[PDB]
Design a binder for this molecule. Sequence first.
Ligand SMILES: Nc1ncnc2c1ncn2[C@@H]1O[C@H](COP(=O)(O)OP(=O)(O)OP(=O)(O)O)[C@@H](O)[C@H]1O
Ligand SMILES: Nc1ncnc2c1ncn2[C@@H]1O[C@H](COP(=O)(O)OP(=O)(O)OP(=O)(O)O)[C@@H](O)[C@H]1O
Ligand SMILES: [Mg+2]
Ligand SMILES: [Zn+2]
Length: 848
Amino acid sequence: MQEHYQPAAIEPAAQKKWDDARISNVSEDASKPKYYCLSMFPYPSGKLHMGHVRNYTIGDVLSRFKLLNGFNVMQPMGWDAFGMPAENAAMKNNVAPAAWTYDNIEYMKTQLKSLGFAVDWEREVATCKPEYYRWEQWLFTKLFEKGIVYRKNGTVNWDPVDQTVLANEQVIDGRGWRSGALIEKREIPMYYFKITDYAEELLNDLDKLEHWPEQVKTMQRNWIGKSRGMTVRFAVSDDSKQGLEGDYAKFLQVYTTRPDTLMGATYVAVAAEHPLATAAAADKPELQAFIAECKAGSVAEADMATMEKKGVPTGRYVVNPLNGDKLEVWIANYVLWGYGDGAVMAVPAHDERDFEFAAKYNLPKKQVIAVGDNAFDANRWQEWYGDKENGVLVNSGDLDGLDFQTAFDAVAAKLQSQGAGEPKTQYRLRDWGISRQRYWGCPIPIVHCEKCGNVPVPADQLPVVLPENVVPDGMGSPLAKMPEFYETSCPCCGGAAKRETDTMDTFIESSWYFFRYMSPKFSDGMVSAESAKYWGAVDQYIGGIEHAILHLLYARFFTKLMRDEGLVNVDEPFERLLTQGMVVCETYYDWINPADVELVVISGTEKMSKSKNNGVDPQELINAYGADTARLFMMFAAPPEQSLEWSDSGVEGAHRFLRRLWRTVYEYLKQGGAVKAFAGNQDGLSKELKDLRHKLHSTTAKVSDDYGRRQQFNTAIAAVMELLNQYDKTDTGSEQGRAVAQEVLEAAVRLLWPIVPHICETLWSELNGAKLWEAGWPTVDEAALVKSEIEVMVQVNGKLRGKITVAADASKADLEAAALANEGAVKFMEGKPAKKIIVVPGRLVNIV
Ligand SMILES: Nc1ncnc2c1ncn2[C@@H]1O[C@H](COP(=O)(O)OP(=O)(O)OP(=O)(O)O)[C@@H](O)[C@H]1O
Ligand SMILES: Nc1ncnc2c1ncn2[C@@H]1O[C@H](COP(=O)(O)OP(=O)(O)OP(=O)(O)O)[C@@H](O)[C@H]1O
Ligand SMILES: [Mg+2]
Ligand SMILES: [Zn+2]
């Protein structure tokens, strides 16, 4: 063993040893319990940064822990390769997105290999290969014929100068980002997943996820946005039907989640696109001006809550079906056409939005709910006005005295009897729009034939291959300008036809990649039945909380779709979620990387990302310090969920601890070479050695619980540091001394192998000839945790009457119980009671 830690030498050697042993290349091996640990796969940026290092070290720590415990661990890696960044790089450098992607992939892969992750590279996938995306094309065609995927007109942001559809992210203040021209809203045919059909399942199955963070479930529930409410019809008055056609002539239908307050309705509001708004504005130019100002606004909720709520009265009137009141209709900019009925009732006494609306326009407020003796101020909004759990109805006829749920059900039966309403469930969830007017994505397997309609490509003809010899320009999809791509024959009649030129939402690739990892060379289906049966679901998923919504929702949706097609047999893809805090670092700029700088403006610490260029290249850190220093620093600097600050001092600390670990083992074996680790009965060991073994086996139980239950790796490292501290203060020079030292060192390097496997692998080989992964995770010797018994003097009225042997963990009540039963106290207390029993732990007990 060389004297000095040399990571540049030992880290490649260790990586080659694990590779030749194929410990990370796994099969569906029934002889071993499976563990599937997945980290969210990366987009091929070109270069990884410390955030990716942190995410993937965390996944590798968990994988290696389960490995050492005997599990058949699958930890796969791959590339989320489709999307816009490659298209922007293509426009900049005049290269094909495919070429730019594969070059970024090869570089990032070597970056990952040099960090020493225990990754099954034989299961590697790149989502832009036809071998991958043919299967989401396949599932598209299968769902299309079931109607679960359908084609429908939807609205998009059209830029009339760049001649391209824009996302909302690139429409700033109503104009194009790179053009500034005023955007048109156009309706074009597009494809959708009918995800609303699965809303109840996506909501209820969250209860099955007993090991998910509660907030992630809460975010999923809020996004789906289920509500149980009431459809309520208000009859149109006799005088207010002019211009109304159809059902809109007879009643105004609204949706409310507070039907218990229907007696308190004072006005009603419709969306600017509602038929009643259109009829009233026929001769009112102010209503036309208002309608037009609403239609020229974002229904985006990011602007809806921060929007000033405005309305104008229509002069039209409807009748409340419960109390008979005639209420005026208002047009309001907050009523969204498309959600529910596009019309609402307003109860300003018990809904905050309605309260502010009615205050501005002096519209009436009628109290119908009371919470105790709380006083109702028509001019001041109190938070209990909207209390739904502790309230009771008021001014509501025969509904007086009921609580929310009882009133809800009474209104339900009342309205159904009068035919003016019924219970209804709504969801904020909309269907999932699939179509993108972009080149670098999965082609949509549809053919358009003027005879047969829009026809899916037969499975025998899949994939529809995306041509890779293409350099996008920024002025529209190249696919729609490539007749050699879109000109085809119809698969149903054989006539001349046109391929769909839109591509798929790149969320689709990451919605099932975790199943493809189970059998990524399988060419007869998305995933083989045998491999899906063996691997089941993902045991552990590690990735940022920013994806806790759409990505997770889509992945759970696809899981259920694939289950329904009989491809997998689980309801949920991810059993546990770990979402790691972001790594942050200072900024400089005109955005500059901090590596390029020496101690440009020096702005404020902020998350590492490509947008402000503050991403620190791990390759610089590995060249300077080694992979193990990188991994240790990230695992030690903070709990995984907490944010991590880049610190060169933190790197220096990690490296010097690795030297301390090296120095310890080398010094130990300089002083006499390897011996058999201490094992077995420890009676007869010196107090100092018994205490080091107590520290050792306490450290083992603590590290095991921090890896396996708490997932807090910083404290696990601190515990092993305390073990080494006690080791350093223990004389291990004797023959039993050396045996315990060997046992300590053999445990320490196994305990840290998940964090820093390169140094631990090399150190282990110098301590012990067995294979580290066969010796397995260190076990707890519980005999080593029993401290020694004490002798306690039993006194009666002060005079010593007996002695007792109690444990070193015995409470003051064990001492008191043991003292009263000692045969010396019994025959000197004279059957009298104890007026007081003074207990001094470890010394004596005295009964008074
Ligand atoms: N098209 C619409 N545009 C705007 N508001 C609407 C629309 N349809 C219904 N509403 C109003 O939204 C209210 C609540 O609907 P929503 O789906 O937001 O439930 P919620 O936020 O869970 O309810 P709550 O306010 O009790 O917490 C209904 O009472 C109704 O007054
Ligand atoms: N600064 C950071 N600190 C910690 N983890 C990070 C950081 N930046 C990214 N990650 C994590 O690294 C993983 C890769 O994220 P990234 O945004 O690069 O790609 P992605 O998940 O494929 O999505 P997209 O296609 O939008 O880029 C995620 O789990 C993310 O949470
Ligand atoms: Mg369960
Ligand atoms: Zn045809």
